[PDB]
Design a protein around this ligand. Structure first.
Ligand SMILES: *[C@@H]1O[C@H](CO)[C@@H](O[C@@H]2O[C@H](CO)[C@@H](O[C@@H]3O[C@H](CO)[C@@H](O)[C@H](O)[C@@H]3O)[C@H](O)[C@H]2NC(C)=O)[C@H](O)[C@H]1NC(C)=O
Ligand code: NAG
Ligand code: BR
Ligand code: BR
Ligand code: BR
Length: 274
């Protein structure tokens, strides 16, 4: 009936922080409860902040009437500043011509227990990724396929970035089926910086075979400045631990690394593609 856009994943226990309605053609949009908003031919902006000790967990925008648009291939809703895992969001909606009204809902969790690990990891992390999509494997190497029906940019050779419902993804490097899911690690806003890193176990049984990396970040513009996520050197068999480096140009608000393991891997999986 409307068209629905999501940043983050709603869960039942989430508190309701804010909901409101906006006419998108109005000059100026009608401020609701002090949150500055604005309308344009091209943009709707809501400057939201919660003066309470909560983390934003999910934002949903529904627009009317329903139009023709596969939103999984675009990012028309995003936080220019703040976002998931913080108490603020400068919410940006890139509207289309026929879109004239919008309903906004914003959910949160206590800042004390600001963890999203469960809702993104789920029950079957081995076979289901953090988008709710099941890993799929090609017939030659048995390594995971590139997702086909969602937003994805490429940059430098080997760099592929995915976006769905506000959540970004990059994969280092290939998943194989006999790999097992070891643990998932999250960094929350209090541990995030322009450049930060985490240390992973890498000895014996827990030989890191594959990293599935997800994050939310601010984007100044519709096109994001993607981060440089990379091992600090090679993650070889002798390394007792492996350090993952997050070298960002735009600030991340929350990050989640799925750690897959395999004693049989040597750290390097490559196809004859060049
Ligand atoms: C319709 O409304 C949107 C939202 O307000 C306008 O987009 C805004 O445009 C200005 C100017 O292009 C952007 O300013 C930029 O700010 C950064 C802050 O660091 C600065 O580095 C840039 O050089 C630039 O000055 C602003 O960010 C941008 N806002 C969003 C949310 O994208 C748009 O211009 C309006 N359309 C008009 C006026 O025709
Ligand atoms: C592997 O160990 C070497 C020796 O200290 C180190 O220089 C390198 O950064 C390690 N690799 C990772 C990914 O931590
Ligand atoms: Br603005
Ligand atoms: Br959760
Ligand atoms: Br953790």
């Amino acid at each position: 009936d409307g068209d629905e856009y999501f940043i983050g994943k709603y869960k039942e226990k989430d508190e309701t922080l804010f909901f409101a309605s906006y006419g998108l053609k109005r000059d100026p949009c009608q401020i609701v409860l002090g949150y500055k908003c604005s309308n344009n031919q091209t943009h709707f902006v809501l400057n939201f902040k919660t003066n309470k000790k909560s983390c934003i967990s999910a934002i949903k925008l529904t627009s009317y009437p329903k139009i023709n648009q596969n939103s999984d291939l675009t990012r028309n809703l995003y936080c220019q500043t703040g976002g998931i895992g913080t108490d603020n969001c400068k919410l940006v909606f890139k509207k289309r011509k026929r879109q004239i009204a919008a309903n906004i809902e914003i959910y949160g969790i206590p800042a004390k227990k600001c963890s999203f690990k469960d809702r993104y990891i789920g029950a079957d992390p081995l076979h289901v990724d953090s988008y709710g999509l099941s890993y799929q494997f090609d017939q030659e190497h048995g390594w995971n396929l590139e997702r086909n029906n969602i937003f994805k940019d490429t940059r430098f050779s080997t760099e592929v970035f995915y976006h769905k419902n506000g959540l970004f993804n990059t994969q280092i490097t290939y998943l194989a089926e006999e790999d097992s899911f070891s643990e998932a690690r999250e960094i929350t806003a209090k541990d995030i910086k322009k450049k930060f890193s985490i240390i992973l176990p890498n000895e014996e049984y827990k030989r890191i075979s594959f990293l599935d990396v997800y994050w939310f970040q601010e984007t100044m513009r519709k096109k994001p400045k993607y981060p440089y996520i990379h091992y600090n050197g090679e993650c070889s068999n002798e390394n007792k631990t492996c350090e993952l480096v997050f070298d960002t140009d735009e600030l991340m608000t929350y990050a989640l690394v799925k750690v897959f393991t395999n004693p049989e891997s040597d750290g390097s999986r490559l196809k004859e593609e060049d």
